[PDB]
Every structure is written in structure tokens, then in C-alpha cells.
Design a protein around this ligand. Structure first.
Ligand code: WO1
Length: 460
């Protein structure tokens, strides 16, 4: 029974519009309909993991699990195992996996974040699941963000609150939020970003959709434009959108968008929009390939159409040698040369680095760097040659070149992280000085950069 080095992951997001689903939802899990769809020749091939995010979900967990399991069994003839299910209000995440993966999956976490204060705390937020799959950490977030075309800033704030406060993954990675804790992080949901065009243009927009001419609509998609201006989802990826806007439809057909202001909308227009989205962020130089991203055409109980995305995702095996785990492999070492952190902070305080990685017995604290001034006023923390030599638990290059080092730059005075980043050890060469780089973020906001050289020694 060989351990996989690749799995496929299905991500689904559906705002169910508080209505039970139709009797057949198989098209969703088959990635059929509009956009980048899955080849018919793959229909009987199960994905390894199915992650289902719903919003405005009127079903009990039991009712929805029974529908999902019966759907996958009908498609695949496989009885999928429940990894995790978590519900906040009407926001739900279900993770199903093939039974052969039961003993590959461990460290299952669930959490939720409620967004907003008083007025705004009551129905929006996120649920999430993480686990290990052999040597690979996987995180999944289903968020239902603030509605309304005029509230893109609120959505960006909701995103900020969710990535700060969602407690998934390894709690020993204390300086790191969910945007750094996982080999692969998938964030999906009713993100509620809208096509930001004048109200009077609604019929023009509908025309554009009927012509499958999305270019002029996507150029006004608030998620794409906010991402381009680095207001949200910094360092996340999204597949190109080639399907019609998934909101807001008249129920029981897909032929009609319902966009006009009504008492029930709070006298707001709902111009056709790509509310329903899947984004991801993987550690550098890990295999992740989007193999589908689209919407179904035949599921019409909601004012949203379901969205699907599928991924190839690189995974690693749970490595055991004669040495690690439980002792350093003295054959291996990670060295750092000419290392500098450039920070955006206006503060003048001493900094040190922490190195965190599952290839180390425990995190490593550096000595303090020496602060200098960049040309354009900036704080530059010099580490030069002073960073420690890291001693990985296993020196085998088949393990070590697949690993990553998380870096936090911490204030000596407060121990608060000013910036988090990640370095891949998937180098072009070993025993060779090679450039390294990571941006540094805090609360998912760009706070600086870390650059230098690495020199990696493996058993080879
Ligand atoms: C929501 N945003 C997105 C950009 C980064 C961060 O921006 C601010 O906090 C801010 C204050 C004044 C102007 O920007 C949070």
C-alpha cells in the first residue's frame, strides 16, 4: 500500500438561500456546468478529500451529511468517511475523505469566528477545519462575509478578523496565523464581493452574461480589484473565472437574474456578481494545480448557484529514519548568510527571529539583529552571518528538500511578531549558497521582507 505523493481535493461552496437542496446535486461534485469543468472520463474517479462549505444552510448536520454521502456513493460507489463537520449559525463546513485515508488523517481541528460588533454580530463569519494528511498540513475556511455592494471594506475587515482569530493547525506555531500554518490553505465561501458597476447598467450586465462576455464585468469584480490593490487575500491565488456570476438568480430557473431593489433586499440592488469563490495559498514550491473552477447549471433551489473547484495537491509521507523523529540527524544542517529583514514599522526597537518547522525538534530563537536605515527611510534589521545553524531531525534529502521554515521577526521588548513569512527548502542545489526571499506579513498585511542566502546540507 504505497503512500500518495499527490491527492485531489474537491472544494464546494454553496449559499443554499435557506432552502432544502434538490434531490440530485451530483453535478456539483462532478465539476459540471459552466467555467473550467472536469472531463467526463474522470466521473467515477473519487477525489481524495471533499470539503463542502454552505451558507444560509437550512439543514441539520445529520440531514446534510446523509445527502452528501448518498451523492458521493452514487457517483463513486465509495462510502466516504466524515473527517469533520462544523456549523456556526447557518455557515457549515463538511470534510469527507475516502475510507483508505482514515489512518493518514490526524490532528483534526475545527473552529469558527463571528465577525462584526453588536448590530453586525449575529449571522456572518467563518468556520474552518484543519488536519494532517501524512506529512502535509491542510486548512479549510468557509466564510460568509458581509453582504451589499457598498460594503467591500467590511468584507476586507471580516477577512482580517477571520485569519487572525480562527484557531486551526498547530498551536505551537504561536506567532503564525492560518495564512502560514498549512502546506495548503483553501479559503472559500460566499465572500459577497460584487460587480461594482452603476445600477442603471443592470440590463447591460445581463446582456454581457448572456453573451458569455465576462471581461468587462470581471474588471469591476470587487474581490479581484481589492486583491490587486492588496486590500484583502494577499498572497492567495484564484483560478481565472470563466463561468457566469453565481448570484442573484430567481429560484427554480437559471434563466433570470433578480437584481432590482426590493423591501426584502433592504432597497439594495444585487447586480449579478461572483459572490461565491474559492481561493488558496500553498507554501512556496509545493505542487498545487487547479483542475476545475466553475458553477453548476442544474441546481436552482437557491438564489446562488453552487461553485466547485478541484485541486491536485502535493503531499508528503510521515517520514521515519533510525535517527529522527526523537533525535537530530547530525548529517543535516541549514545555514543562513547575508540575511536582512526590511520592516515597514515606524517603531525603533530591537528584533530577533524565530525559525519554526516540523523538521526541527522545536522552534529556534536567533540573537538580536542590528538595526540600520534603508535609503528610503526604512528599518533594516541586519542578521548578516549571525543566524543559528538549524539542525533538522532528518537529513535525508527526500524529506528535507520538501520542508519549509516559517520565520517570525519579533520585538525583543514585547515578543510580538512584526512579520511572518515562509522559506521553501526545495532548493536548486545543496551545499551551495542560494538566494532566499519571503515577504513578511502580520494579520495578513504586508509588514516587510526577509532576504538572504541559504546553504542546505543533506545526507547526500
Ligand atoms: C482592510 N485593510 C486592508 C489593507 C490593510 C489594512 O489597512 C488598514 O488598516 C488601513 C488603515 C488606514 C488605511 O488602511 C486593512
Amino acid at each position: 500500500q504505497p503512500e500518495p505523493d499527490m491527492i485531489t481535493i474537491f472544494i464546494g461552496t454553496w449559499n443554499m438561500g435557506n432552502a432544502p437542496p434538490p434531490k440530485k446535486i451530483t453535478s456539483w461534485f462532478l465539476s459540471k456546468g459552466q467555467g473550467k469543468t472536469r472531463d467526463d472520463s474522470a466521473d467515477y474517479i473519487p477525489h481524495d478529500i471533499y470539503v463542502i462549505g454552505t451558507q444560509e444552510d437550512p439543514l441539520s448536520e445529520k440531514e446534510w451529511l446523509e445527502i452528501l454521502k448518498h451523492s458521493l456513493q452514487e457517483i463513486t460507489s465509495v462510502t466516504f468517511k466524515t473527517v469533520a463537520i462544523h456549523t456556526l449559525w447557518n455557515i457549515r463546513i463538511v470534510v469527507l475523505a475516502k475510507p483508505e485515508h482514515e489512518n493518514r488523517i490526524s490532528h483534526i481541528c475545527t473552529d469558527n469566528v463571528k465577525t462584526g460588533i453588536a448590530n453586525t454580530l449575529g449571522n456572518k463569519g467563518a468556520v474552518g477545519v484543519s488536519f494532517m494528511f501524512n506529512g502535509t498540513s491542510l486548512g479549510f475556511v468557509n466564510s460568509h462575509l458581509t453582504s451589499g455592494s457598498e460594503k467591500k471594506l467590511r468584507r476586507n475587515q471580516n477577512y482580517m478578523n477571520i485569519l487572525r482569530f480562527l484557531a486551526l493547525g498547530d498551536k505551537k506555531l504561536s506567532p503564525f496565523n492560518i495564512t502560514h500554518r498549512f502546506t495548503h490553505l483553501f479559503w472559500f465561501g460566499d465572500l459577497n464581493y460584487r460587480v461594482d458597476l452603476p445600477t442603471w447598467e443592470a440590463e447591460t450586465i445581463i446582456q454581457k452574461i448572456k453573451q458569455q462576455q465576462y471581461a468587462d464585468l470581471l474588471s469591476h469584480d470587487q474581490l479581484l480589484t481589492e486583491r490587486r490593490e492588496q486590500k484583502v487575500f494577499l498572497h492567495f491565488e484564484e483560478e481565472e473565472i470563466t463561468f457566469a456570476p453565481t448570484y442573484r438568480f430567481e429560484r427554480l430557473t437559471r434563466d433570470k437574474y433578480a437584481y432590482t431593489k426590493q423591501k426584502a433586499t433592504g432597497m439594495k440592488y444585487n447586480l449579478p456578481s461572483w459572490c461565491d469563490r474559492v481561493l488558496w495559498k500553498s507554501y512556496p514550491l509545493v505542487h498545487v494545480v487547479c483542475q476545475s473552477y466553475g458553477s453548476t447549471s442544474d441546481i436552482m433551489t437557491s438564489d446562488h448557484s453552487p461553485v466547485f473547484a478541484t485541486f491536485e495537491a502535493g503531499v508528503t509521507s510521515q517520514f521515519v529514519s533510525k535517527n529522527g523523529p526523537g533525535t537530530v540527524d547530525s548529517q543535516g544542517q541549514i545555514e543562513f548568510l547575508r540575511c536582512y529583514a526590511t520592516l515597514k514599522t515606524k517603531s525603533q526597537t530591537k528584533f530577533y527571529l524565530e525559525f519554526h518547522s516540523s523538521c526541527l525538534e522545536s522552534f529556534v530563537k536567533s540573537q538580536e539583529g542590528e538595526n540600520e536605515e534603508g535609503s528610503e527611510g526604512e528599518l533594516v534589521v541586519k542578521f548578516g552571518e549571525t543566524l543559528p545553524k538549524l539542525k533538522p531531525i532528518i537529513s535525508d534529502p527526500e524529506y528535507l528538500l520538501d520542508q519549509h521554515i516559517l520565520i517570525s521577526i519579533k520585538s525583543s521588548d514585547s515578543d510580538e511578531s512584526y512579520g511572518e513569512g515562509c522559506i521553501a527548502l526545495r532548493l536548486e542545489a545543496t551545499e551551495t549558497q542560494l538566494p532566499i526571499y519571503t515577504p513578511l506579513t502580520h494579520h495578513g498585511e504586508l509588514t516587510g521582507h526577509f532576504q538572504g542566502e541559504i546553504k542546505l546540507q543533506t545526507s547526500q
